[PDB]
Amino acid sequence: HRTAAHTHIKGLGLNSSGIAEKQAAGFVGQCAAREACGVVVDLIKAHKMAGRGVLLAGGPGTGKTALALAISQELGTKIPFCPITGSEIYSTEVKKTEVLMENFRRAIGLRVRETKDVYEGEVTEMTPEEAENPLGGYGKTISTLLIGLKSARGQKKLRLDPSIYEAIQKERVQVGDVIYIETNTGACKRVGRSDAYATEFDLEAEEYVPIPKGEVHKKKEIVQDVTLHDLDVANARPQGGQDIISMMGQLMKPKMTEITDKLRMEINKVVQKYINQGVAELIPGVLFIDEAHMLDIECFTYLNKALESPIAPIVVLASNRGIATIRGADDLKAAHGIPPDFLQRLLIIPTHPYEPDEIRRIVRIRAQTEGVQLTDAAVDRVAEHGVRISLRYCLQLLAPASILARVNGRTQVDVQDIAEAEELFLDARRSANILTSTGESGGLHGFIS
Amino acid sequence: ADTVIFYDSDWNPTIDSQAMDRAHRLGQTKQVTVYRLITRGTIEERIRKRALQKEEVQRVVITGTGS
Amino acid sequence: QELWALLHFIMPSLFDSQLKRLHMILKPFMLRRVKKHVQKELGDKIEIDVFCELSYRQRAMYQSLRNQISIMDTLMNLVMQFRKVCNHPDLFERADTSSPFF
Amino acid sequence: GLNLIAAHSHIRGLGVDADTLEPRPSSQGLVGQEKARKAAAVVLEMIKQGKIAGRAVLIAGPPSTGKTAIAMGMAQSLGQDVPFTTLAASEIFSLEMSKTEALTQAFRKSIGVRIKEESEIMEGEVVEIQIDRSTGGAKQGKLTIKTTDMEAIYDMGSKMIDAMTKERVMAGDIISIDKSSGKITKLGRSYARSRDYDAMGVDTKFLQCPEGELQKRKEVVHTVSLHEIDVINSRTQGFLALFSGDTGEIRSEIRDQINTKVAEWKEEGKAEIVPGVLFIDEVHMLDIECFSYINRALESDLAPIVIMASNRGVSRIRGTDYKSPHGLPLDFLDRVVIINTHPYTPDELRQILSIRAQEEEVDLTPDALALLTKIGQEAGLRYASNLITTSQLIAAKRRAKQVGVEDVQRSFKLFYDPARSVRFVQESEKRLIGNDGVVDFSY
Ligand SMILES: Nc1ncnc2c1ncn2[C@@H]1O[C@H](COP(=O)(O)OP(=O)(O)O)[C@@H](O)[C@H]1O
Ligand SMILES: Nc1ncnc2c1ncn2[C@@H]1O[C@H](COP(=O)(O)OP(=O)(O)O)[C@@H](O)[C@H]1O
Fold it and tell me: Chain C contact for B35, CB < 8 A?
């Protein structure tokens, strides 16, 4: 609903033959790059490949991020699209190569069938039974709970292990509540009071709920979408048991941890059981590392090994820089800001500047996307920027000009409202002239160097 | 009753025209309103448009009087 | 043919197996009158259309269901599933108490 | 499966004649690099022989000359018999622990303690479980189990009845019981009882009954690394840190105790020590402090063989301001023998591309393989290998059964090689942001 930089991008706008239509799905031009991004979408949808690298290479404002977000739409919702900047990699909690691995495994998805095996009913009896322990000093302990559950078409009496009674107890269950119990986790949920004895005169603000229909014991099945990283995190910070470690692990502050290769390898074994059991579909996705020049030579040297993994997502890099110094390696210059031995691994999609008539088309697509109804002379005005000034400066003027027109009582933007927008809101270059002319000498009114 | 709400349109307009008659009969005296919850952008729309054009054919085939 | 079957039933000798013909031949056998003429003491019906769009859950059901048209077209099955989600998505998949993947 | 096609998936071993260490011109997915493969096979021999401790080998050569491939070939030709640790040198720059501690843990991971143990396992189909649960529970109960060859009934002790009820063991369930622990694993449901499993969904699998005796001794050969023993001894659930990480810096006196105890188990004959390999990929990412530690870690008796790869020429050593070959200090390089990988000839590129075109499901027409070979000479082995996947996807878009020259040409046109990418950069220097931060956005 809110309008943002890429709201007009809907897809790559390719033909079924995989050729780009010159203006489609919000794009203008970049046709060769849109066609290359199509073949990458094909590489992703065909699950066969791991750890292929793609670089979107081209100057700022050439639509590299529009291409990546268009890929994210051609893949649809099922496939994991995992966007990061290279500046997200420098965590204070864990080494930066941990964050890369977390993002690599966040980019691999799993759809898995799960059977939830549960008991549900109105609690009709609850009777604890206990033993006098030998002198451990903590005193007597509950040995078991007997609990009666009533549903609409049956009842049970359950003799619980005391670890499930602790779930029952920490859930503050009472006689006459409706509860849900998972035999999977031993976990308990208090659903409400019965709709029996639902007298209004409680301060307790209870939700009275109907008796569960059907039998007390149920075995429902549901399909869960998870990433491999979701499994890593669950098993590294255990929280689904009723044991003391799972209990205290919910009270401690959450913190990220440098999950070992040993854990990740053994979760591959676990997930492959789900595949062989036929309960899971593996759905590998894509990791988009925007601003990949902000990675350092330790990140890039780790990506070597990470991409060689027998499962890894597709990695799409974007860079906007020429021959530049590699970060963390001030001795080494290379194109794109990428180490030369890593660049060998990638397929590079070069991305090119727009022509003046393409800029005019983009301005009109963008104007009608923002709902800025805009006269043709006004379009020509805005499209003379983008040629003389960055393309982004065109698109950013459309909103001020709309406000100024509406404040002038116009239904639509004239050249006048842009000519006022051009004056209130400068580009970087006009502002850079103001600096150099005013900071031409120091003083009270100078800009600070 | 004085109000009929169709949660669903039927493929046959005669059945809904019968259904909405239940309130609109010689014993009625309040105004009758009929509401029809056509969910927009769905085949609930095409079902209603097909049923509505059939009612025109059924009215054309009774162009001449039966009186 | 559904009009013939009624006419065959009442008068099977004549009607054993264009509008200017129909309205003449049926003049004896059908009598019809309408509330506009004889029962105009009643008001007319007010028919109000009440459009509402698919909620975000319904359209998640509906669009993933419509995705099957990329493979099939079963269409008479799909138009019943489409009618379910257009009524309430709990008809198609009942929402129920849920928890993370274990 | 969960293993997808990856860059090294075609490597099945080292491709060397085990009787002579003569490298075959191609086998097991390796092509050429014969002298390097022979040397890696001599290293592989003395790894398996175990008698030699803490030697370090560097594999040195230009990028894409098969350095990782040879490392993967050794790993595939050691298999499970020997520990094999792979370390990217970037990994030791932990925030949890100092880099010498991280580098210690990597050495400890590469020595295995091999421990052989037995247990009686009882396995069969449950014919019946009777449990009285007589107010309290677990009072008494009887278990009947059969194989195809025997049937027996057992009176159960009360803590076994708890185990049976905990596992909801049911008639028809195929179970194994480890007797000394008393854990019950339900291996499956017997097919003959399928109709009793009225709660199980149709997705449920079934099995035939177990065969032979209900009870036998099954012998397990565990291998546990010195690192695992170190971490186990750190805290009350130390092993739990082998997964999450969150090991601290493990105290040196814990390791020194463990080294003594493992020497006792060896002398007592209770355990064997199995020296593995640590492979340090792109070792030049280590700094001068790391190399100083490695120098003496290699002199330990419980040191693995360390194998290393470097792309680097005479290059700046990290953490200092002078240059040395491989980017490695000469005092460290004095402790290391070096294996060189050379560039490939055009026919070896053709063979590697052919192998890669077998590992992916691709049919190359003979002219498409010739063109990819030509692109391989001109643009590098890795780029032509990525054109294989691209061409198949283009061919499938035109519904072709085989990849033709037209598909390779589309690939070459759509995706630039590194040199054309650099040339594109060298032309676009005003539009690309320079090292000065300067850029022009105008047309
Ligand atoms: N070919 C195109 N068609 C339509 N809009 C485009 C195109 N290329 C870029 N844009 C738009 O121009 C703006 C700047 O492009 P952007 O993707 O931010 O460039 P980069 O990410 O390379 O700096 C964005 O709002 C983007 O949607
Ligand atoms: N001799 C060889 N036989 C088979 N495949 C090879 C050979 N050399 C390299 N390759 C393959 O080509 C790719 C690049 O080689 P690689 O071993 O990664 O070189 P480096 O590690 O030195 O960059 C890898 O996928 C590798 O499997």
Answer: yes
Contact between A165 and A173 under an 8 Å Cβ cutoff? The reply is no
The structure was resolved to a resolution in Å of 2.8
Do B31 and C53 count as a contact with CB atoms less than 8 A apart? no
Measured between CA atoms, the residue of chain D closest to residue A258 is: D245
Contact D281/A48, CB-based, under 8 Å? no
How far is the C-alpha of D307 from the C-alpha of D277, rounded, in Å?
7
| Measured distance CA(D313)–CA(D311) in Å, rounded | 7
Give the other-Cβ count within 10 Å of D334's Cβ: 8
Strand pairing class (A27-28; A286-290): unpaired
C-beta separation of A406 from A433 below 8 A: no
Q: How was this structure determined?
A: cryo-EM
Are the beta carbons of D172 and D200 closer than 8 angstroms?
Answer: no
Spatial separation of the C-alpha atoms in residues A370 and A1, rounded to whole Å = 10
- The crossing angle, in degrees rounded to 10, of helices A415-424 and A391-407 is 110
Stretch (H or E) spanning D186: strand D184-189
- Report helix, strand or coil for D56: strand
From the CA of A8, give the closest atom in ligand 1: 27
**Is D65 annotated as a binding-site member?**
yes
| Chain C partners within 8 Å of A240 (Cβ) | 100, 102
From D352, D353, D355, D383, the mutation candidate for ligand 2 (largest count of ligand atoms within 8 A of CB) is: D352
Structure token digits, residue A365: 């697509």
Taking the C-alpha atoms of residue A38 and residue A349, their distance in angstroms, rounded to an integer, is: 11
Query: How far is it, in rounded angstroms, from Cα D89 to Cα D105?
Result: 13
Contact yes or no, C with A (3+ CB pairs under 8 Å): yes
Residue A216 vs residues A148, A212, D240: alpha-carbon distances, Å? 10, 8, 37
Residue closest to D375 by CA, chosen among D406, D404, D350, D396: D350
C chain contacts of residue A185, beta-carbon cutoff 8 Å? 99, 102
Is the Cβ–Cβ distance between A63 and A30 less than 8 Å?
yes
DSSP state of A308: T
CB contact D114 to A (< 8 Å): no
Task: Spell out which residues of chain C touch residue A207, defining contact as CB-CB under 8 Å.
Answer: none
* Helices within D298-345 (DSSP H only): 330-333
Q: How far apart are CA A139 and CA A3, in angstroms?
A: 64
Q: How many Å from the N-terminal Cα to the C-terminal Cα in chain C?
A: 60
Q: In what order do the strands lie in the sheet with A314-319?
A: A81-85, A286-290, A314-319, A53-57, A346-350
String of DSSP letters for C67-100: GGGGT---HHHHHHHHHHHTT-HHHHS-------
Per DSSP (E only), the strands in A202-359 are: 208-209, 217-227, 280-284, 286-290, 314-319, 323-326, 329-335, 346-350
Distance (Å, whole) CA B40 – CA B44: 7
Q: Tell me yes or no: is domain D346-425 CATH 1.10.8.60.
A: yes
Which helix (H) or strand (E) is D176 found in, with range? strand D173-178
Under 8 Å between Cβ of B23 and B4: yes
Q: Give the type of residue at D385.
A: S
Host H or E run for residue D105: helix D99-108
> What's the A38 CA to ligand 1 centre distance in angstroms?
17
CA A376/CA A387 separation, integer angstroms:
17
From first CA to last CA, the distance across chain A in angstroms is 42
**Mutational pocket test of ligand 2: of D86, D307, D326, D382, the residue with most ligand atoms within 8 Å of the beta carbon:** D382
Question: Which residues are registered as beta bridge partners of A120?
Answer: A180
* Separation in Å, CA D308 to CA A433, D8, D83, D218, D326: 54, 18, 16, 40, 11
Closest by Cα among D39, C83, D166 to B45: C83
Q: Which chain D residues are closer than 8 Å to A324 by Cβ?
A: 433-435
Q: List Cβ neighbours of D17 (8 Å cut-off, separation of 6 or more).
A: D23, D24
